[PDB]
Design a protein around this ligand. Structure first.
Ligand SMILES: [Zn+2]
Ligand SMILES: [Zn+2]
Length: 288
């Protein structure tokens, strides 16, 4: 994916990203943020007062300090009347709102902070550092990125050389597997946990699988992201996976069926200083 690039034009930056080009004022003071990871980065950098709208319908528990901000709807169910009312100087989006880019760009400069699943850390650092440059906080952001890299190193220290993981998303009663360079790929691509099939190629929604598959593969770890939790559905991964086939796996027998927090893994996607730190530590705690 194309990175964000920024040029100094005095009172503003000329910014190019994979969706287009924007003139963004320095120190934007009225920012509408539609990417939850970036909202967490604002919080980390003490930029809370700059934030004028958030997608309150999908506001994670870890970001409840933003519960009094004006709502602009949800990450998919965007309230354009509400956005227009706030008269933002900047709107920040990621992939779920790329379909709305032209409409948003008629409200305010609209910055895209996408994540490249083939180059996650590169994408991450670019997004954080570009936001920080708007405010003259590169030094502070670098320090926080360095700290996350140290935590990655520490986590890698305890990762097993040989054990293998399956990464699955559950939605309704469907189980979909993900691998390297896909969504949720950082468990492999960043932390180096081996995948049960390293050469698996999946689409955007993963590879539909069943419990016979899971047992055939016999993973050492099963990392689960339960989208049922986000939807408020009846079924949950714990019930889906409570069967005699899954029980026979190394993961089940070793209590290494790990239910990852979907507010971080599905909603924030690790696109923030807070979320990514937390997610690295979450994995570390699961495998150590
Ligand atoms: Zn060795
Ligand atoms: Zn590998």
């Amino acid at each position: 994916m194309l990175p964000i690039s920024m040029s100094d034009e005095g009172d503003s930056f000329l910014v190019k990203d994979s969706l287009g080009e924007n003139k963004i004022p320095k120190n934007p003071s009225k920012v509408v943020i539609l990417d939850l990871g970036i909202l967490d980065t604002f919080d980390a950098l003490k930029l809370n007062d700059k934030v004028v709208g958030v997608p309150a319908k999908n506001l994670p528990k870890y970001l409840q300090q933003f519960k009094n901000k004006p709502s602009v709807g949800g990450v998919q169910q965007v309230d354009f009347e509400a956005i227009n009312a706030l008269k933002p100087d900047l709107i920040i989006i990621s992939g779920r709102q790329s379909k709305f880019y032209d409409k948003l760009k008629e409200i305010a400069p609209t910055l895209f902070v996408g994540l490249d699943n083939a180059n996650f850390l590169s994408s991450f650092e670019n997004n954080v550092l570009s936001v920080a440059k708007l405010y003259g906080l590169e030094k502070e952001a670098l320090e926080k990125i360095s700290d996350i890299k140290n935590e990655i190193e520490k986590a890698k220290s305890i990762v097993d050389e040989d054990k293998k993981a399956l990464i699955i998303l559950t939605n309704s009663n469907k189980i979909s597997a993900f691998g390297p360079q896909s969504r949720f790929g950082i468990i492999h691509d960043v932390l180096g946990i081996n995948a049960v099939d390293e050469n698996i190629k999946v689409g955007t929604h993963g590879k539909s699988i069943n419990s016979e598959f899971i047992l055939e593969k016999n993973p050492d770890y099963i990392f689960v992201v339960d989208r049922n939790v986000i939807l408020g559905n009846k079924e949950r991964a714990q019930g889906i996976l409570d069967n005699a086939l899954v029980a026979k796996t190394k993961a089940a027998q070793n209590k290494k069926i790990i239910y990852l927090d979907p507010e971080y893994w599905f909603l924030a996607s690790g696109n923030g200083l807070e979320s990514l730190k937390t997610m690295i530590l979450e994995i570390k705690n699961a495998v150590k």
